[model samples]
Target: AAPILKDVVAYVEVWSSNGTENYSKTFTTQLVDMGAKVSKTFNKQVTHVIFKDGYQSTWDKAQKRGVKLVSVLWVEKCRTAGAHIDESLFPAANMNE
Candidate 1:
């Protein structure tokens, strides 16, 4: 048998650029249910950061640090697919661009 799954190690920076509160908790639960280990703090093990789009200092750091930034819809896509989804498919709008 061959392993067909990739472990998701994610860190959430911002749930949505829209500034809707309380959804972060829901996304947290969903990520855990999806078998992803969510980190409360940023680190090297964090391969993905749940983002929506912003000029926040943290996200800017992620942009510079090579972290994969994906929008909230990415969570829905991965939740539906039952697998680690591609980050590019749900990218946050680059404010700088």
Candidate 2:
């Protein structure tokens, strides 16, 4: 049977200052070093790095660098397949709006 949308299992939302030096370099280097290939879906508006494992490992490493809100969602099985995300999805506290 074809995989359905609900088969998606889990999702992680991420927001980063696109095109910023720090965010780009950090994400690129880490992903490449971890045997992951990076792709862009939003033309620098955002980035999604998909992996089959090591989600938590990436989150912990990124958190140490002040990259905040990194989250991981696993399948109901809770240990097999999932995604990792780190982003500035929520507006910063200093926004003037």
Candidate 3:
């Protein structure tokens, strides 16, 4: 399975490529500009964006960029602190491939 983000406001999984070269980056930057606090990349197939309060709004914006929204895992209490991500989510590639 790919990495899972806990306590995230919003999480998006779409295609990825080198830096801003891919079309995904366009939407990625849009999410960031709208107050998305963090992002993590897993493989060429998936890119995840995390929001501050929640992602439904910025997620709606990403969809405007022609990007696809994947999983939306919501929680009552937030677990992540600051910008520090769990190390388990940092592998270079998807394990199940």
Candidate 4:
């Protein structure tokens, strides 16, 4: 069975601003297909923020709000596995470091 992310509200962004349009659409489609409620804007209700690159401001806000900031690989891997994955395995460090 597929991982149920119906309870998860996510905000997605690419690492760079140069190709945001394409990335945003693609990521949003996948997230929605996986059952997560994708937010168009960041807010207090956001449970996760997945990105490909490290942005200081966004990272800081997510940290302060206790949101799970993970790499795009997290989504890909979970989709591949057909289940929710361990957050530790897809930490922000994977994208930052």
**Number of clashing residue pairs in every model?**
0, 2, 0, 0
**How many angstroms is residue 13 displaced in model 1 relative to the true structure, after the best TM-score fit?**
3.1
Ranking by TM-score: 4, 1, 3, 2
In model 4, state the lDDT of residue 74. 88
By TM-score, the better pick of 1 and 4 is 4
Candidate 2: give the clashing pairs.
15-87, 15-88
lDDT of 3 by residue, 31-79 (tens): 4444443345332333344322223444455445433333212111112
lDDT of 1 by residue, 6-93 (tens): 3767777553446564356677677887777888777888887786543476587778889888887898888777666677898865
The lDDT of each candidate is 0.70, 0.30, 0.35, 0.76
TM, every model: 0.76, 0.25, 0.25, 0.81
lDDT of 4 by residue, 44-84 (tens): 88998886654567787887898988878888887888787
Worst 10-residue lDDT window, candidate 2: 1-10
* C-alpha RMSD in Å of predicted model 3 compared with the true structure: 14.2
Task: Let me know the TM-score candidate 2 reaches against the reference structure.
Answer: 0.25
Cα lDDT for residue 11, candidate 1: 74
